[PDB]
Write a protein that binds this DNA or RNA. Structure first.
Lengths: 148, 161, 163, 160, 116, 109, 141, 154, 175, 97, 165, 142, 59
RNA sequence: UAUUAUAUUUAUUCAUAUAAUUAAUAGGAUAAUAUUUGUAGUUUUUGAUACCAUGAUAAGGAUUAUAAAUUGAAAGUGUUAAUAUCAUAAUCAAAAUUUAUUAUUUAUAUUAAAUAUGUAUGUGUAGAUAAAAUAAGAAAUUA
C-alpha cells in the first residue's frame, strides 16, 4: 500500500550503504508543475554529487525502472550516517538509490514490482572488515610471518 | 677549549663500514632494473611513466586551441590528426591461439617477485615497435578517417568544383 | 551509593568523591521573568536592558534563558550562594541600561564595503590633476625614451629614498 | 560539500608513484603543506627520521589545523561587509529587536509578518543606504546615492 | 637586544602569528595612495564612520594594539613562520585521561548525560 | 579540480547594487533550448564523427540521452555541455540491450 | 620465559675508560660544534640562488618581462639584502602585493634542498656532496 | 603539471586490471576524452574500451557461465581469444592516451614528469630536479636548475 | 536458533555464548509487541521507522511558534530542514512551469483531448481500478518549502545552536 | 573551592603572603634564567633558520676563538677561551650577594 | 588587513552607545575572565572536525585548541586545568590496593571481632601447615631466620631446648 | 628481557619490536641526546622558552650532607667551568666526571654532553654470542 | 515541591534492587533576591577598568 | 562428471628497561560527660626469594555453503592453587640496543612548549622471502 505523508505529499524512504557509514532517507515529493529538481543534503544535486554522470545516473535509475518522469517529483536525500565532507562515491549513490526506490514504492506501490525485480530495494549485506589491531592496515593484512 | 692536537681513544674506534649496496638490506646493487624506460621505441617510452592530465591542462589546451585555431593555423592540427590516424585504426582480431603468456606456475613461490618481474620484463619488450597485432604502415587502408590533409575542413576551398 | 560503598572505611571518602563530583549547581533563569517591574515603578529590565544582558553574557543564555553553572565549591550550599551572587552581579551589571542611552548596547551592522556604483568614481577622483600630471609626465617620458630602453614610473611618479 | 581531501592518509607502507599512487607526502597534498611532515630518502629507522613524522595522530592534527586555515581563508575572503558599531537609535529597523547571540537561539528570522525570513545574522547593509546614520553630518556624502534598476520600465527585458 | 632575534625568545605567553612591526599609514587604499603613491591626493583616507568598526569580528581585541585580521589569501599561511604540533597534544581537561585509548572516567555515567 | 582556473574570489555580487548597467536576465535553458542545442550537439558530433559514430548501438537514442542529459544538468546549460561529454561513462543504460534482445528474439520469428 | 641472565660484570677500569672516552668525545664535540656553527651561519648570511622554478608561469616568462620586470623594479634590492633565502624571498613576494596569491598557487619553487644552494650554481652534485660533518640539519653550504 | 619526481613503471595488463578503480576510472576516461574533444579527434579507442568496461562492471557481481566437462576443451582457448582481443583493444588505447598527453604537453608547453619522453620536443626523457645527479636511465649528469624544454615566450 | 519473537525479550548472557530471556523462558509473541492487527507490527499502521519521525517533523513545523520555542531545549528547535528552506533567500521565488511544458500539456488536453495526470494519478495498476485516487493529487509546489534548499551558514548555525542549547532547558515552565 | 586554580582566590592571596613571609631575596637572588647563563657562550646568539636566517651575521661568529686554514676554508681548531675569559658582569648588574 | 584595534568612547559619537570592548571588560570582570592580550587577530581558527558537521565527529564545542604551540608548561593552560584533587586518580588510589578487605577495615580488627584471634594469610597458613607436616615426618632441613635474635641466641633464665633424635 | 642488564631485565618482557604510542615510554632511554643541531642548539634537547628558571639539580633545596653525582638535568653554567669542581653524571657504567670543562657547554643541560650510546663497546660485558652479533652489524671487527 | 514526597523518594536508595543504584536529579524553582546598597546598578566609574585589571592572577 | 573459479595483485633496510628492609586494630561538634586529652608486656622461628619450588585462558586457514548466517579452533603461549632451604635485587622521573617473530614519513615551502633520533642521493636495482578472493570491482587443469 502507499504510505505517503498525507498533508505533506512526501514519501519518506530509507536507504543505506555499509550499514553504518552511509544511511540516507529520500523525502520524495510529487511535483505537478514539471519543474525537475533533485536535492541532496539541502543543496542542488549536481553541486552535491560533483556533477558526475555515472554517480547521478544511478540516482535517476529508479524513475527509469518505473518508467516515470523525474520532472514530476521532488527529492531530498538526507544523510543520517557518517556525515562526511564529500559523499560523491559509488557506495553512497547506491544508498541514495535504495532510499529513492523505497520512497517510490511508498508513493506509488505497483512500482514496487519493477523496483523489486531490478533490485533497487536490494540491500548489499556487506561491510568492511572491522577495525582490528592484528591487521597492519586494520582490515585485511596480518603482520609478516617468519619461520625460524 | 684548546682542542688537543692528539686524540686518545674516541677517534680510534672501529670504523663502521658504510652500507655497500642500496635499497632493501642496503644490498641492492647499481645495475639496470625492470623500471628503465626506452627512448628509442615509440613516442611513448616503454614502459611508460604514469602521467596524469589535469583540468588546468585541459583549460590550457583549450586556450591554445582557440589561439592556433584563430591564427589561421591548421598545421599542428593536421599533425595531431595524422598522429591520430597512425595509431587509432582497429587492430585485427587475434588469431585463435594467440594469448598473452601468463607466467608458468610451479617454479617460484606463489608470493614471489619473479612472477611479476617476468610479466613486466616481457611487457617491456612488447613495445609499440613489436605491436604486430594492429594495422600500421603504408599497407593499411583507412576507410574511417580522412586520407589527405586536404579533406580537412579548414582547407575547404579545395573540394569546390 | 547503596551497593558496596555504603558501609565501611571507604564509605566516607566515597561519599566525599560522589558529592564533590556532583557539587555542580546549575542556575537557569527566565529573562522573560526578568521582564518585570522594579518596585520603584520602573520595569526591572526593558528591551534595552535585556540587550545589555545578552551581550554581557556570551554563552550563559540560551533559548531565552540564562544559565550559570556554579562549579566552584565542593559543598552544594556554597555553590548555591556563589551562583546566586554571580547571577545577582551580572544582573547589577546589565541593569546599567536603566541609566541612559550611554549604556544602551550598540548593534552590530554588517555594513557592506563600498559597492561598484560607488567604486566606479574611484577612477575619476582627481581626474583633472591626474590627467594634468599625465600631460606633464608624458613630456618627461618622451624625453626619457632617448635615455633608457624602458621608462618605468620609478622615474616618473614612483618615488623612493635612495638610502 | 567539498571535493578536497581533508584527512591525512593512514601511515602505512610506502605509497609509490604510479597510477593511483603518489608519495604519501608529495607536493600536491594540502597545497604543498606536506613539506612540513615530509622527510627524504629511505630513512634509517633506528637513528634518523623525526619521530613525529611517523605517528598518525600528530600528523593528522597538523593536517587538521591546515584544513581549518583553509576554512578561515575562504570564510574571511567571503566578506564584503564590515561590522560597524551603530548605536541603537540609528540602526535600520530590522536590527532594533532582541537578536539572540550566536549559537543561542535558532538563527533568527528578519521578519515573518513581512514575507522575509532572511538570515539577520546574514543580512548585509550598504554604506550608500546607511549614509544618513554614520557620517550623516560629515558634509558631502563620500559615496553617491544608489542608482536603481527599474523593473516596471519598458526596456529590452520586457521584449521591447 | 631581545627584539633583534625574533625566534629565540618566546615567553610562555608569546603567541602566533607573530604580528609585524607597523609602518606609517598602511591602513587602506585611499590613505595608501595619499601618503605612498600620490602624496598630493585629495582624500585623507576612506571616509570613516565616526563609529566603531569591529573589523576583527567577532574577536573582541585590545584597543591600542596593532593586530592583523584572519588572512584571505591561502598563501600567507604557507608562508608564515607558524609551526606544526610536534610534541604531545594536550587539552587542559582531556589531559586527565592521558590518551584516547586509556580514556579515564570517574563514574560510569552515560555519555549523553544531561547534567541538571 | 574543475575550478583550478577559477578565481579564488568567493565574493558575492548584486546586479542592481553593483552596476550602472541594466540587467538582462539570461536564466537557464528551457527544455526547449536545451533540446535544440542538444540535438545539434548529439547529431553534429556524429556528422563530424566527434562522438559515438560506428559505436552508436551502445549509447541510447535521443529521447533518452536527452532525458539523461537534462536530468544530470537540471536543464542547466553548462551541465548539458558537460553531460553530453560525460555520456561516455553512463553505466546504467539498457535501451540497447533490450533492443538487442528484441532483435535476437524476433529475428528468429 | 627463560630466566634472564644477569649482565656480567662491567669489567676492570672500564668505568674510567668510558670516562676518558666520553671526555674526549665531548672534547671533539667542542670543535664539531664550533665548525658547524661557522658553516651554518655562513649558510644563513650567504646570498642564495633562485628558490622558484623557471618551469612554470609566471616564472617561466622571459627574464626581461612580466613578473621579472616587477622583480627588478620593486624588489631587486630586497632579495640581495635578505640573501635570496626561499623563506624571506617568498615573504617579500607575499608583501609585493601586485602578484596576488600567485607566489604559492602559480609560482613553482625549488624543493627545500634545491633551494638552499648559494647563488649561481650549475652542478647537480652540490646538494649530494655538501659536507656531512657539519651537523646543520643540512643547513650548510 | 605538478608531479615531477620519479614514477613507477607498470605494464598495461596490470594498469588495465585495476578495472573500474583507475583503468575504467570514469572521471579519468572522461578527462582524457576531453583532451580528444579539444584537439578535434574521434574518440574511437577510448569509447571502445569504455563500452567494454561498462560491460565488465555491469557483469562483475555475476558468476561466469557454466563450463562443460569436455575432454576436447574448446571453450577454454575461445574465451581466451575473446579476453585477449579485449586486452589488445585496451593496449592500443593505453598507447593512444599516453601519446596524446605527451604531445599535448609539448603543445601547452607544459613540462612532463621525470624521464617522461615527449617526442614533440626532446628525443629523450625529461630529467630535471631529480633525487639523483645522474640520469635515471642514461646515467648522464643533470644540469642545474632543471633542464629547459620549450620556448620562453608565455 | 531462538524463537522468532521480539528481540527485546532476549538478553545476551554473560560468559555464555548464548542468549537467554530475562523472563525465564516465559514468552510473548511478536503480536504482543504491537497494536491489535498492527500492519507489519507497526506502532501505527501509517508509516515505517523513518516515515513516522518525518511526518512528525513536518507537523511540528506546521505548528511551530517562536515565542513558544523559548525556554525549551533542543525540542523547541524547529525542523532543521523546514526552518532552513523557509530561511533561504532564492527560494522565495517559485519558478513557473516551462512554457514548452504548458504547451505540451495543452496540446494533450486541448488538441489531443486527453487529460495529463500527476504520477499519483496515473493508474499504473493493471487489473483493479485505482479509484479513489490519492488525495495528494492536487498539492502545490513551493521551492520555498520543498525541495529542501538552504544555505550553509543556515545549516551550521542551526546545528551548532541546536547542539549548544541542549542544556538550556527551563524544565519548570508554567504550562 | 574545587577544580581549577581559577577558583582558589583566597588561598592564592594566602600563598603569595606565606611565600613572601618565608622566602628571602637572599635565597631567590641566585636563581638564573637560561639566557643570563647562556650569555657566556662563544656564540650566545644565532638566528634560527626559519625567519631571521637572513638576519644571521658573520660578526656573531667568534673567529677570535677558533682558527682557519685558507687552502680549503675550514675552521680547524679552537683556542682556549676558558683561560682568558674575563667577564665584568659574572652575574648581571642586578645581582648583589 | 593590518588594522589598528581602535575604540572610540561613548562620548565622541553624536549618539552614545555601549561599546563592545567595554562590554567585554564588564564580562571579564563579572566572570573572572583572563583577557589574553597577545591573542593575535589572524588566528580565529575553529575545529571543523568538531565545529563543522561535515565530518563524522561534529561536536559543536571546540573539543580542543587548534594551536600547535601547546603544552601544560603554559600558565594560560594551568589556569583552565582541572586538578587531580577528587578525580578518578584519587578513587583508584583509595580503592585499588592489592587486597580489597584491607580497604574496608583492618584485618586484625575484623578478626578479633568476628572470630577471636587475628588469623594469618591463606599463604602464611599454607607455610605453617607445611611446617606442621614436613616437620612431622622429617626434620633437619630448617633454618632459624628471625627478626630479632637476642632472645634465641639468649634464651631466658630457663628454657634449655631439647636435643632431638 | 634476555640478558638482564639491570634487575628489571629480570622483571620486564620484551614484546618483540613492539610499536609504541608517540612519546609514551616506560623507560626513557634518551638515545638521541648528543645530537648536534646547529641552528637549533639552544632548542634541541633543551628547555623550551629561553627565559626559563633553572632545573633542580641546580640548587641545594635543603641541608644536605652532600651528593655523589649530579644529573644531566642540571644545566652547564659559569660555575661548571670556572669553579672547576667535580660534577658527575650517572652514565654507563658507574659515573662520568666533567673534569675537562669548557665554555661551549655553558647554557645546555649535560645530556647533549654525556654520550648515551658509546661507539666503543667492551666485549668484556658482551656474550660469546653478542660479539659475533656486533661483528654482524658492523661494530667490532673479526 | 513536597519535602514529604521527597522523603519518600530518598529511601528508595535502600529498597532498590541488586547491583542497582540511583542518582537523584532535582531541578527545583527557587527565589534569589537582587538588591540596591550591596549590588549597585550605578554608572560606570570615572577611572576605566582596562584589560590590565583582568590579566592572569588578576582574578 | 555434477551441487562450478587462486595466477593475480599489492610487499621486504626494523631498535630500546631501573639506585634493597611487604608482619597489627585503634571511632573527635550540632549525640545527657571515659584525658581511653597522648589505648607503651621486645627479642621461638624459616618457602613464591637473586633459588628448586606441579596444574589453569594464545598464534596458527585447505573441503558441514547459501539462505533469513561471521573468513578464527583446546591441547595452551611468562607471571596463577600443596616439592623448599644460596644470597633483600622492582618504576616516585630523565635511564646502557643483540633482541628472529618488524609495514618509514620519497624533492614547492623542514625545530613553539614535560625534550623527542644526524643519516643510508644513486638504473625500484642479489638470493630467498610477506600479504590477501571479506565494499569493493579478480575468473577456470577436484582430491
Amino acid at each position: 500500500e502507499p504510505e505517503v505523508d498525507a498533508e505533506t505529499g512526501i514519501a519518506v524512504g530509507r536507504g543505506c550503504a555499509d550499514g553504518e557509514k552511509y544511511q540516507f532517507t529520500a523525502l520524495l515529493r510529487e511535483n505537478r508543475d514539471h519543474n525537475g529538481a533533485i536535492t541532496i543534503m539541502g543543496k542542488p544535486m549536481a553541486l552535491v554529487l560533483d556533477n558526475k554522470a555515472w554517480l547521478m545516473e544511478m540516482l535517476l535509475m529508479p524513475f527509469d525502472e518505473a518508467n516515470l518522469d523525474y520532472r514530476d517529483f521532488d527529492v531530498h536525500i538526507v544523510l543520517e550516517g557518517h556525515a562526511m565532507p564529500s559523499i560523491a562515491n559509488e557506495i553512497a549513490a547506491f544508498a541514495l538509490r535504495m532510499s529513492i526506490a523505497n520512497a517510490l514504492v511508498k508513493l506509488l506501490p505497483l512500482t514496487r514490482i519493477p523496483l523489486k525485480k531490478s533490485g533497487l530495494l536490494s540491500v548489499d549485506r556487506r561491510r568492511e572488515r572491522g577495525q582490528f589491531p592484528g591487521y597492519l592496515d586494520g582490515k585485511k593484512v596480518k603482520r609478516k610471518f617468519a619461520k625460524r | 677549549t684548546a682542542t688537543p692536537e692528539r686524540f686518545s681513544i674516541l677517534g680510534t674506534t672501529h670504523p663502521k663500514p658504510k652500507r655497500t649496496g642500496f635499497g632493501r638490506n642496503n644490498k641492492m646493487r647499481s645495475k639496470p632494473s625492470d623500471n628503465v624506460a626506452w627512448y628509442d621505441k615509440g613516442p611513448v617510452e616503454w614502459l611508460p611513466r604514469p602521467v596524469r592530465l589535469t583540468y588546468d591542462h585541459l583549460d590550457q589546451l583549450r586556450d591554445w586551441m582557440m589561439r592556433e585555431t584563430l591564427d589561421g593555423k591548421t598545421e599542428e592540427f593536421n599533425r595531431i590528426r595524422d598522429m591520430h590516424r597512425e595509431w587509432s585504426q582497429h587492430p585485427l582480431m587475434p588469431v585463435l591461439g594467440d594469448v598473452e603468456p601468463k607466467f608458468p606456475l610451479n617454479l617460484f613461490k606463489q608470493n614471489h617477485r619473479a612472477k611479476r618481474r617476468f610479466l613486466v620484463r616481457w611487457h617491456k619488450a612488447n613495445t609499440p615497435a613489436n605491436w604486430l597485432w594492429m594495422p600500421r604502415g603504408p599497407t593499411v587502408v583507412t576507410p574511417l578517417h580522412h586520407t589527405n590533409p586536404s579533406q580537412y575542413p579548414e582547407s575547404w576551398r579545395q573540394m569546390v568544383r | 551509593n547503596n551497593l558496596e560503598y555504603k558501609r565501611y572505611d571507604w564509605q566516607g571518602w566515597y561519599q566525599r568523591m560522589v558529592d564533590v563530583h556532583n557539587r555542580n549547581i546549575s542556575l537557569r533563569c527566565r529573562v522573560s521573568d526578568l521582564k518585570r517591574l522594579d518596585p520603584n515603578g520602573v520595569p526591572f529590565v526593558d528591551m534595552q536592558t535585556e540587550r545589555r544582558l545578552r551581550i554581557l553574557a556570551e554563552g550563559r543564555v540560551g533559548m531565552g534563558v540564562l544559565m550559570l553553572d556554579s562549579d566552584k565549591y565542593e559543598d552544594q550550599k556554597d555553590n548555591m550562594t556563589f551562583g546566586s551572587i554571580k547571577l545577582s552581579e551580572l544582573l547589577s551589571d546589565a541593569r546599567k541600561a536603566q541609566l541612559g542611552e550611554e549604556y544602551w548596547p550598540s548593534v552590530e551592522m554588517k555594513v557592506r564595503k563600498p559597492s561598484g556604483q560607488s567604486k566606479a568614481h574611484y577612477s575619476l577622483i582627481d581626474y583633472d590633476r591626474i590627467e594634468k600630471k599625465s600631460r606633464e609626465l608624458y613630456e618627461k617620458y618622451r624625453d626619457a625614451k632617448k635615455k633608457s630602453l624602458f621608462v618605468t614610473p620609478m622615474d616618473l611618479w614612483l618615488e623612493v629614498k635612495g638610502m | 560539500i567539498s571535493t578536497g581531501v581533508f584527512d591525512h592518509l593512514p601511515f602505512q607502507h610506502r605509497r609509490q608513484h604510479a597510477f593511483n599512487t603518489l608519495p604519501l607526502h608529495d607536493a600536491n597534498h594540502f597545497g604543498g603543506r606536506t613539506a612540513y611532515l615530509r622527510e627524504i630518502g629511505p630513512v634509517n629507522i633506528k637513528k634518523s627520521g623525526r619521530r613525529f613524522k611517523k605517528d598518525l595522530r600528530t600528523v593528522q592534527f597538523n593536517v587538521d589545523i591546515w584544513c581549518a586555515q583553509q576554512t578561515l581563508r575562504k570564510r574571511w575572503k567571503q566578506r564584503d561587509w564590515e561590522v560597524i558599531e551603530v548605536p541603537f537609535r540609528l540602526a535600520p529597523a530590522e536590527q532594533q529587536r532582541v537578536i539572540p547571540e550566536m549559537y543561542t537561539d535558532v538563527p533568527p528570522m528578519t521578519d515573518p509578518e513581512r514575507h522575509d525570513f532572511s538570515n539577520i545574522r546574514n543580512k548585509v547593509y550598504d554604506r550608500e543606504e546607511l549614509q544618513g546614520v554614520l557620517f550623516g553630518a560629515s558634509g558631502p556624502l563620500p559615496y553617491p546615492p544608489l542608482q536603481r534598476i527599474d523593473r516596471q520600465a519598458m526596456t529590452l527585458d520586457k521584449f521591447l | 637586544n631581545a627584539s633583534k632575534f625574533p625566534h629565540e625568545y618566546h615567553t610562555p605567553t608569546s603567541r602566533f602569528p607573530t604580528t609585524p612591526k607597523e609602518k606609517e599609514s598602511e591602513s587602506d587604499w585611499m590613505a595608501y595612495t595619499a601618503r605612498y603613491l600620490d602624496k598630493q591626493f585629495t582624500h585623507p583616507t576612506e571616509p570613516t564612520p565616526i563609529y566603531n568598526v569591529n573589523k576583527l569580528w567577532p574577536m573582541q581585541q585590545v584597543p591600542g594594539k596593532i593586530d592583523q585580521t584572519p588572512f584571505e589569501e591561502d598563501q600567507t599561511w604557507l608562508l608564515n613562520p607558524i609551526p606544526v604540533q610536534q610534541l604531545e597534544q594536550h587539552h587542559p581537561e582531556k589531559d586527565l585521561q592521558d590518551l584516547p585509548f586509556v580514556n579515564h572516567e570517574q563514574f560510569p555515567r552515560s555519555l549523553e548525560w544531561t547534567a541538571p | 579540480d574543475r575550478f583550478t582556473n577559477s578565481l579564488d574570489e568567493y565574493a558575492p555580487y548584486d546586479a542592481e547594487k553593483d552596476s550602472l548597467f541594466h540587467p538582462i536576465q539570461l536564466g537557464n535553458f528551457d527544455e526547449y533550448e536545451f533540446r535544440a542545442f542538444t540535438r545539434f550537439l548529439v547529431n553534429s558530433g556524429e556528422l563530424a564523427g566527434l562522438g559515438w559514430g560506428p559505436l552508436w548501438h551502445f549509447s541510447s537514442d535521443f529521447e533518452r540521452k536527452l532525458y539523461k542529459i537534462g536530468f544530470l544538468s537540471n536543464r542547466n546549460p553548462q551541465g548539458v555541455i558537460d553531460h553530453y561529454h560525460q555520456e561516455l561513462v553512463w553505466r546504467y543504460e539498457y535501451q540497447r540491450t533490450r533492443q538487442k534482445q528484441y532483435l535476437l528474439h524476433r529475428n528468429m520469428e | 620465559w627463560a630466566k634472564p641472565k644477569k649482565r656480567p660484570k662491567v669489567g676492570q677500569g672500564f668505568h674510567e675508560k668510558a670516562q676518558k672516552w666520553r671526555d674526549e668525545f665531548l672534547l671533539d664535540r667542542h670543535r664539531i660544534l664550533a665548525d658547524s656553527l661557522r658553516a651554518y651561519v655562513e649558510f644563513s648570511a650567504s646570498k642564495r640562488t633562485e628558490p622558484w622554478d623557471t618551469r612554470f608561469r609566471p616564472f617561466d616568462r622571459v627574464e626581461k618581462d612580466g613578473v621579472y620586470v616587477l622583480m627588478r623594479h620593486l624588489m631587486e634590492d630586497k632579495f640581495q639584502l635578505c640573501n635570496y633565502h626561499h623563506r624571506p624571498v617568498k615573504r617579500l613576494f607575499c608583501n609585493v602585493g601586485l602578484l596576488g596569491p600567485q607566489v604559492t598557487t602559480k609560482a613553482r619553487w625549488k624543493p627545500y634542498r634545491y633551494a638552499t644552494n648559494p647563488a649561481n650554481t650549475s652542478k647537480a652534485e652540490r646538494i649530494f656532496q655538501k659536507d656531512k660533518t657539519l651537523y646543520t640539519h643540512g643547513h650548510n653550504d | 603539471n605538478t608531479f615531477l619526481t620519479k614514477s613507477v613503471a607498470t605494464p598495461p595488463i596490470s594498469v588495465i586490471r585495476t578495472g573500474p578503480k583507475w583503468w575504467a576510472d570514469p572521471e579519468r576516461m572522461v578527462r582524457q576524452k576531453l583532451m580528444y574533444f579539444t584537439l578535434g579527434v574521434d574518440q574511437l579507442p577510448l569509447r571502445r574500451t569504455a563500452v567494454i568496461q561498462k560491460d565488465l562492471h555491469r557483469f562483475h557481481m555475476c558468476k561466469p557461465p557454466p563450463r562443460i566437462g569436455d575432454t576436447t576443451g574448446y571453450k577454454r582457448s575461445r574465451a581466451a581469444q575473446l579476453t585477449t582481443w579485449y586486452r589488445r583493444i585496451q593496449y592500443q588505447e593505453y598507447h593512444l592516451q599516453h601519446l596524446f598527453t605527451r604531445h599535448v604537453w609539448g603543445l601547452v608547453r607544459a613540462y612532463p614528469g621525470n624521464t617522461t619522453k615527449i617526442q614533440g620536443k626532446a628525443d629523450d626523457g625529461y630529467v630535471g630536479y631529480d633525487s639523483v645527479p645522474y640520469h635515471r636511465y642514461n646515467r648522464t649528469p643533470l644540469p642545474f636548475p632543471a633542464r629547459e624544454i620549450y620556448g620562453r615566450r608565455e | 536458533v531462538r524463537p522468532d519473537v521480539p528481540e527485546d525479550q532476549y538478553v545476551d548472557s554473560w560468559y555464555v555464548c548464548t542468549s537467554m530471556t530475562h523472563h525465564l523462558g516465559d514468552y510473548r509473541p511478536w503480536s504482543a509487541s504491537a497494536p491489535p492487527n498492527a500492519y507489519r507490527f507497526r506502532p501505527y499502521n501509517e508509516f515505517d521507522a523513518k516515515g513516522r519521525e518525518y511526518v512528525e517533523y513536518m507537523r511540528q513545523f506546521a505548528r511551530y511558534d517562536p515565542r513558544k520555542s523559548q525556554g525549551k531545549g533542543q525540542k523547541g528547535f524547529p525542523f532543521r530542514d523546514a526552518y532552513l528552506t523557509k530561511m533561504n533567500e532564492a527560494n522565495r521565488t517559485t519558478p513557473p512551469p516551462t512554457l514548452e511544458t504548458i504547451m505540451d500539456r495543452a496540446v494533450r488536453e486541448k488538441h489531443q483531448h486527453a487529460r495529463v495526470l500527476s504520477p499519483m494519478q496515473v493508474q499504473r495498476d493493471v487489473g483493479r481500478s485505482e479509484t479513489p485516487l490519492p488525495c495528494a493529487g492536487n498539492i502545490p509546489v513551493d521551492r520555498s518549502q520543498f525541495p529542501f534548499c538552504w544555505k550553509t551558514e543556515d545549516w551550521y548555525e542551526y546545528e551548532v545552536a541546536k547542539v549548544r542549547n541542549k542544556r538550556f532547558v527551563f524544565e519548570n515552565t508554567e504550562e | 573551592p574545587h577544580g581549577y586554580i581559577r577558583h582558589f582566590d583566597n588561598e592564592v592571596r594566602d600563598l603569595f603572603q606565606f611565600v613572601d613571609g618565608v622566602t628571602p631575596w637572599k635565597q631567590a637572588q641566585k636563581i638564573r634564567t637560561y639566557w643570563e647563563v647562556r650569555a657566556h657562550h662563544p656564540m650566545p646568539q644565532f638566528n634560527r633558520p626559519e625567519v631571521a636566517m637572513h638576519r644571521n651575521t658573520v660578526g656573531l661568529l667568534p673567529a677570535h676563538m677558533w682558527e682557519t686554514d685558507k687552502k680549503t676554508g675550514k675552521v680547524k681548531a679552537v683556542k682556549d677561551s676558558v683561560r682568558d675569559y674575563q667577564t665584568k658582569t659574572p652575574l648581571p648588574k642586578w645581582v648583589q650577594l | 588587513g593590518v588594522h589598528r584595534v581602535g575604540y572610540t568612547h561613548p562620548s565622541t559619537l553624536p549618539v552614545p552607545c555601549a561599546q563592545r570592548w567595554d562590554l567585554r571588560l564588564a564580562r571579564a570582570r563579572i566572570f573572572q575572565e583572563y583577557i589574553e592580550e597577545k591573542a593575535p587577530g589572524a588566528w580565529q581558527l575553529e575545529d571543523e572536525r568538531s565545529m563543522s558537521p561535515e565530518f563524522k565527529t561534529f561536536t559543536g564545542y571546540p573539543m580542543r585548541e587548534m594551536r600547535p604551540g601547546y603544552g601544560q608548561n603554559l600558565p594560560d593552560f594551568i589556569m583552565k586545568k582541572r586538578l587531580p584533587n577528587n578525580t578518578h586518580y584519587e578513587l583508584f588510589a583509595r580503592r585499588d590496593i592489592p587486597n580489597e578487605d584491607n580497604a574496608m577495615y583492618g584485618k586484625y580488627l575484623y578478626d578479633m571481632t568476628v572470630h577471636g584471634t587475628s588469623l594469618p594469610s591463606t599463604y602464611r597458613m599454607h607455610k605453617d601447615i607445611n611446617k606442621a607436616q614436613r616437620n612431622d615426618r622429617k626434620l633437619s632441613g630448617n633454618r632459624f631466620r628471625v627478626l630479632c635474635s637476642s632472645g634465641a641466641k639468649k634464651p631466658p633464665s630457663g628454657w634449655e631446648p631439647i636435643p632431638d633424635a | 628481557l634476555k640478558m638482564a642488564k639491570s634487575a628489571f631485565g629480570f622483571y620486564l618482557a620484551r614484546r618483540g619490536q613492539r610499536k609504541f604510542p608517540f612519546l609514551r615510554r616506560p623507560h626513557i632511554k634518551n638515545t638521541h641526546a648528543m645530537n648536534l643541531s646547529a641552528p637549533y642548539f639552544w632548542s634541541f634537547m633543551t628547555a623550551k622558552s629561553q627565559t626559563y628558571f633553572l632545573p633542580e639539580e641546580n640548587y641545594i633545596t635543603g641541608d644536605w650532607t652532600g651528593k655523589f653525582f649530579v644529573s644531566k638535568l642540571q644545566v652547564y653554567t659559569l660555575q661548571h667551568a670556572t669553579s672547576g669542581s667535580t660534577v658527575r653524571v650517572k652514565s654507563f657504567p658507574s659515573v662520568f666526571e666533567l673534569s675537562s670543562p669548557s665554555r661551549w657547554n655553558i647554557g645546555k643541560e649535560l645530556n647533549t654532553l654525556t654520550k648515551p650510546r658509546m661507539d666503543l663497546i667492551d666485549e668484556q660485558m658482551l656474550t660469546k654470542k653478542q660479539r659475533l652479533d656486533y661483528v654482524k652489524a658492523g661494530l667490532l671487527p673479526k | 515541591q513536597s519535602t514529604e514526597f521527597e522523603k519518600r523518594m530518598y529511601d528508595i536508595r535502600h529498597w532498590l534492587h541488586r547491583q542497582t543504584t540511583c542518582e537523584f536529579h532535582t531541578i527545583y524553582r527557587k527565589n534569589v533576591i537582587h538588591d540596591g546598597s550591596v549590588f549597585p546598578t550605578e554608572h560606570d566609574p570615572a577611572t576605566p577598568t582596562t584589560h590590565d585589571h583582568h590579566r592572569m592572577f588578576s582574578f
